[PDB]
Amino acid sequence: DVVVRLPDVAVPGEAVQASARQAVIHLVDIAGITSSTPADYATKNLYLWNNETCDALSAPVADWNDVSTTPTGSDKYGPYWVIPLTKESGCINVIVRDGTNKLIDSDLRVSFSDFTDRTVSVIAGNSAVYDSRADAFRAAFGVALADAHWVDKTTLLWPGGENKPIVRLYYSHSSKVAADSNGEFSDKYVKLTPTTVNQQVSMRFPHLASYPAFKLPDDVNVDELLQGETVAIAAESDGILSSATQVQTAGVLDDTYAAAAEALSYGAQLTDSGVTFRVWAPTAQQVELVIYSADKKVIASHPMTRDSASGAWSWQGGSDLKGAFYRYAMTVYHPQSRKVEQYEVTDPYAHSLSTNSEYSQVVDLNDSALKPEGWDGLTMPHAQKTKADLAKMTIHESHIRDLSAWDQTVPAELRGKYLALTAQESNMVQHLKQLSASGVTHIELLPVFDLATVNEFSDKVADIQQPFSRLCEVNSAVKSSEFAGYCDSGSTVEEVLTQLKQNDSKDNPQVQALNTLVAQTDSYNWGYDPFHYTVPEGSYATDPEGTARIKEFRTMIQAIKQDLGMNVIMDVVYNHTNAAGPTDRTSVLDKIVPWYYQRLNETTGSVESATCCSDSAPEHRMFAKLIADSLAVWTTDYKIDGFRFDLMLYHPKAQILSAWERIKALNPDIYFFGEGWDSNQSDRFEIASQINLKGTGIGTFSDRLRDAVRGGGPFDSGDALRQNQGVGSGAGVLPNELTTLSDDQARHLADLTRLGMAGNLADFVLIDKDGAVKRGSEIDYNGAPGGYAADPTEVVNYVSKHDNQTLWDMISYKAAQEADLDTRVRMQAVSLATVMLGQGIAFDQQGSELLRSKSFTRDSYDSGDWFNRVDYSLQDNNYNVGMPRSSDDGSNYDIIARVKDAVATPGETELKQMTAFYQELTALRKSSPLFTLGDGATVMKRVDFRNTGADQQTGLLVMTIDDGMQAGASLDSRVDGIVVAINAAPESRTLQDFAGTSLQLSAIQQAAGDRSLASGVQVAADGSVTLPAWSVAVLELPQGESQGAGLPVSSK
């Protein structure tokens, strides 16, 4: 059949041949595809220079600003330059340009050794030298991009194949398809024939459903084609190639191997009677198991056995391999580099690792030696079975270093370690113990799986508590910086940072200047950089070499549950990997099965980075299985109680639900929740968003109450940070000098806050700012329906988290100049009360109870111990410790300088006051089942609000919870109802709604005396209740001999 080959038809000839002592360079202008008039090549020149490697040029060009080296002549195929030479031997340096812009990105070096005639031709941005314009012309018809998609055994979707009479799929086992010396495409191929995309493919990949489809013969040996490179090619009737592109094969890989591969188990599976290693690598040509000694010397290399049906490789050995280190030697084709790579990779299913994750290790997590005393009997301190149980969840989001890096009462060797949680006599542990006794029920841990952004080899790291001399020894950027003079000083880094504070300002942000360098080689990072999904992080262990970290992690889990009495939630990041490609140190998955575990751009094949990094593909079957298998280990072997899915929105709704079904078989009470924002992936599959997860039981963080109370949004910059006041900072009622918020806008935020305190349900009914009856879904939130949930347990309310500015820093940006320090502390408590006293699950950042500040830093992931400091000795809240990182907050320096010093920085008196307020709120939350009803229908039958409508007193939130006869059964034997009143305003407010009812202040607040958030509250004889400025009161209707009238929800 017709032999497809490069365009040899109207191929450009040679304009001229170099004469004696001279070389000519052609600039093939592909625009000659039509040529109907002489183009202008006047503003086109070359940059010549003869130096070391090449010095044949005779009298080259002076400065780069020289544009006189114009064409010697030109024709329909482009211009050409006649360059003088001193000798016809050697080589010359050239740079084709167009005025001053590098027409080509490379220092082309024409050697007279490779091109004797010294006559070559180049192309616009091709970085290559040809011996003729003919070769270059055809060079523009090579393989480009990767917009071809092999989605199943017999289907290929590719745009460039429409019309083209000749559509084929070429392939080469160990080579890169292109064109032989004769400019032809010899390699074998499979003829493609136009067809209509089946219903199976359209459903699997909706975003490609409109692509021109092609059919493959049934007798095609798919397995063999997938062993090397495959390229889609199109050609006209005569057989001339128009385009050639690479192929994305994730689709056919699943269609061919997934089912069989899903049925197997992976990793180094050790029993006490032997071991079986298995890794999935359907496209690899060879895979060998390399065993290493403790000192990392190769003990043996075993070729593995491939299973044809699954594409998995295995090797079985004896129990003596327990504890051995290993890697998989891969021989596989990687589309990004277009070559059969050869490299050793760690196990994606690794369960143990060597220092810095260089080698995986064989381990049996069931081994008693890897478990603390009594581990198997560890029980969950808090119930998570019923919705009522779940609603009591009150989360404290913490970080391993944030907890103990600064605590001098924690043994030095345990600071920043998992084991710090076992130091019962430390300030930090005693603080957490008290928070637990007061109502905090869960500890959520930032990344404790194997992250990549912290070097686990201690000698390569330097922290601020150590000598500056150590920093200089491990960080070359510091040694070559303006801070180099501190290298041979006798100061520690923190001592230097402290002295830099006085002269630090928006005009001289020297604190962050030095810290930015320190961040490169310290032990700090949030860790949203996945290296291995199912192994604990090593830097948080006292010994990162081998299995040691496993028992230490468990010892920590046991301490939290058994000694501190709190459940544990793990932050997981399956939405992306730290890196991809065949060369990065941390690329594991993309090295073993290239282009399968990552989500790629439909046209270029490039790994997407919408998540921040290397986007993963949870929609692919084997990655979905890896996720579920990983969660199974954390659940069963590490006894985790719940999981917070980072960017859950990038996962298909179906995948998250399937995972939950799997895990519920191991732990029936496991709880799943995560970020359900808009991932922009709806064109590929139904995403796991707030809206789509309604009624599923999967929770999502709610941004409704969060923004209404904090004010503004996470994207605000400049003056907007101060202008956008929230309910918690006096929107409307206590305006600052810049805001333009209307009373109507302030009342809209209150509508969102009330709805949130009722669980942000789509069907909850309330009276809005204008007196209109509205369902939660009818209250607008930046253009979208406000209420979205079916049950309050599907909503996670919060006013502070590791992301964005802390609650205190937001209040500092927004508070009116006249709001004093005491008032700001109460604003922090008032803000937190909307969350703690609400029906949705309560979530909060470690340190809110201590007015935690990050010195205004918005995104502190790599801002180290300095900006993320939490002082459990209670001296201050880390506010005003230097301007934040300029790269991300520099645009906010002006507003920061204007508001920063309004009032004094909180000290011990303020921190103790806040901790008291905080523990009062959490204690109130668990004092009655009425605060955590759990079921949506029950919330609607019992919860209501007062002080609503157009005649409302702005800033006063009044919520009622019925336990009376009209609500149904009495759920609390001590009360017939409860009233929550939050007076977020500078005036005293009087409530007349309950005159003649017999309300009483909660015993918990009464017991706090003048230290209560309700201090000064008065319950009059006539039943009227008066609340002081910025106060919170919980009142109850004491129950008598039998259930009383209560506080029935008003029909609307």
Ligand X SMILES: OC[C@H]1O[C@H](O[C@H]2[C@H](O)[C@@H](O)[C@@H](O[C@H]3[C@H](O)[C@@H](O)[C@@H](O)O[C@@H]3CO)O[C@@H]2CO)[C@H](O)[C@@H](O)[C@@H]1O
Ligand Y SMILES: OC[C@H]1O[C@H](O[C@H]2[C@H](O)[C@@H](O)[C@@H](O)O[C@@H]2CO)[C@H](O)[C@@H](O)[C@@H]1O
Q: Which residues bind ligand X (CB under 6 A)?
A: 526, 528-529, 573, 611-613, 646-647, 675, 677, 703, 714, 803-804, 859, 861
CB 804 within 8 A of CB 796: no
Based on the residue annotation, tell me whether 675 is a catalytic residue of this protein: yes
Residue number, nearest CB to ligand Y: 64
Residue number, nearest CB to Ca ion: 970
Answer with the entry of ligand X, ligand Y, Ca ion, none that 524 interacts with (C-beta below 5 to 8 A by kind).
Ca ion
Tokens representing residue 216 in the block: 């493959």
Answer with the entry of ligand Y, Ca ion, ligand X, none that 291 interacts with (C-beta below 5 to 8 A by kind).
none
Answer with the entry of ligand X, ligand Y, Ca ion, none that 613 interacts with (C-beta below 5 to 8 A by kind).
ligand X
Nearer to ligand X, 262 or 803 (CB): 803
- CA separation for the pair 998, 1024 (Å, rounded): 10
Nearer to ligand Y, 93 or 523 (CB): 93
Nearer to ligand Y, 122 or 252 (CB): 122
Nearer to Ca ion, 279 or 451 (CB): 451
Nearer to ligand X, 860 or 922 (CB): 860
Answer with the entry of ligand X, ligand Y, Ca ion, none that 972 interacts with (C-beta below 5 to 8 A by kind).
Ca ion
- CA separation for the pair 1012, 1004 (Å, rounded): 9
Sign of CA dihedral 672, 674, 677, 679: negative
CB 32 within 8 A of CB 77: yes
Minimal distance, residue 461 CB to ligand Y, in Å:
37
Nearer to ligand Y, 109 or 501 (CB): 109
Residues in contact with ligand Y by CB under 6 A are: 49, 64, 107
DSSP 255: I
Minimal distance, residue 453 CB to Ca ion, in Å:
6
Contacts of 597 (CB under 8 A, 6+ apart): 577, 589, 590, 616, 617, 620, 622, 623
SS3 readout for 335-380: CCCCEEEEEEECCCCCCCECHHHCCEECECCCCHHHCCCCHHHCCC
Minimal distance, residue 64 CB to ligand X, in Å:
33
Catalytic choice (152, 229, 537, 675): 675
Extended strands (E) in 28-165 = 46-49, 73-75, 78-84, 91-96, 109-111, 119-122, 148-152, 155-157
Answer with the entry of ligand Y, ligand X, Ca ion, none that 49 interacts with (C-beta below 5 to 8 A by kind).
ligand Y
Based on the residue annotation, tell me whether 463 is a catalytic residue of this protein: no
Answer with the entry of ligand X, ligand Y, Ca ion, none that 921 interacts with (C-beta below 5 to 8 A by kind).
none
- CA separation for the pair 1023, 1037 (Å, rounded): 11
Answer with the entry of ligand X, Ca ion, ligand Y, none that 117 interacts with (C-beta below 5 to 8 A by kind).
Ca ion
Of 126, 133, 87, 76, nearest to 104 (Cα)? Answer: 126
CB 336 within 8 A of CB 298: no
- Which CA distances in Å does 542 have to 355, 614, 741? 11, 30, 53
Nearer to ligand X, 370 or 579 (CB): 579
Q: Which residues pair with 73 in a beta bridge?
A: 80
Tokens representing residue 845 in the block: 């950042």
Cβ count within 10 A of residue 485: 9
Contacts of 375 (CB under 8 A, 6+ apart): 554, 558
Answer with the entry of Ca ion, ligand Y, ligand X, none that 529 interacts with (C-beta below 5 to 8 A by kind).
ligand X
CB 614 within 8 A of CB 542: no
Minimal distance, residue 64 CB to ligand Y, in Å:
4
Beta strands 241-248 and 148-152, pairing class: parallel
Tokens representing residue 782 in the block: 């930046």
- C-alpha angle with apex 360: 359 to 362, nearest 5 degrees? 135
Answer with the entry of Ca ion, ligand Y, ligand X, none that 677 interacts with (C-beta below 5 to 8 A by kind).
ligand X
- CA separation for the pair 9, 752 (Å, rounded): 70
Nearer to ligand Y, 110 or 982 (CB): 110
Minimal distance, residue 783 CB to ligand Y, in Å:
46
Counted residue by residue, the chain has a size of 1052
- CA separation for the pair 922, 1034 (Å, rounded): 12
Tokens representing residue 840 in the block: 């949705």
Answer with the entry of Ca ion, ligand Y, ligand X, none that 64 interacts with (C-beta below 5 to 8 A by kind).
ligand Y
- C-alpha angle with apex 223: 218 to 224, nearest 5 degrees? 100
Cβ count within 10 A of residue 380: 15
- CA separation for the pair 513, 497 (Å, rounded): 10
Please, where are the H alpha helices in 57-132?
A: none
CB 1000 within 8 A of CB 939: no
Contacts of 502 (CB under 8 A, 6+ apart): none
Please, where are the H alpha helices in 612-742?
A: 621-637, 653-664, 704-710, 720-723
Minimal distance, residue 354 CB to ligand Y, in Å:
42
Tokens representing residue 783 in the block: 């253009």
Catalytic choice (646, 871, 935, 1036): 646
Nearer to Ca ion, 117 or 341 (CB): 117
Answer with the entry of ligand Y, Ca ion, ligand X, none that 970 interacts with (C-beta below 5 to 8 A by kind).
Ca ion
Extended strands (E) in 768-876 = 773-775, 780-781, 784-785, 795-797, 841-845
Answer with the entry of Ca ion, ligand Y, ligand X, none that 612 interacts with (C-beta below 5 to 8 A by kind).
ligand X
Nearer to ligand Y, 61 or 649 (CB): 61
Minimal distance, residue 532 CB to Ca ion, in Å:
8
Minimal distance, residue 62 CB to ligand Y, in Å:
10
Tokens 């020289």 identify what position? Answer: 66
Minimal distance, residue 369 CB to ligand X, in Å:
34
Minimal distance, residue 573 CB to ligand X, in Å:
6
Minimal distance, residue 526 CB to ligand X, in Å:
6
Minimal distance, residue 125 CB to ligand Y, in Å:
14
Residues in contact with Ca ion by CB under 5 A are: 117, 119, 131, 450-451, 519, 522, 524-525, 538, 862, 963, 970, 972, 1039
Of 540, 841, 892, nearest to 715 (Cα)? Answer: 892
Answer with the entry of ligand Y, Ca ion, ligand X, none that 517 interacts with (C-beta below 5 to 8 A by kind).
none
Nearer to ligand Y, 47 or 158 (CB): 47
Contacts of 952 (CB under 8 A, 6+ apart): 747, 750, 769
Nearer to ligand Y, 49 or 677 (CB): 49
Nearer to ligand Y, 106 or 696 (CB): 106
Minimal distance, residue 93 CB to ligand Y, in Å:
7
Tokens 């060009």 identify what position? Answer: 61
Catalytic residues: 646, 675
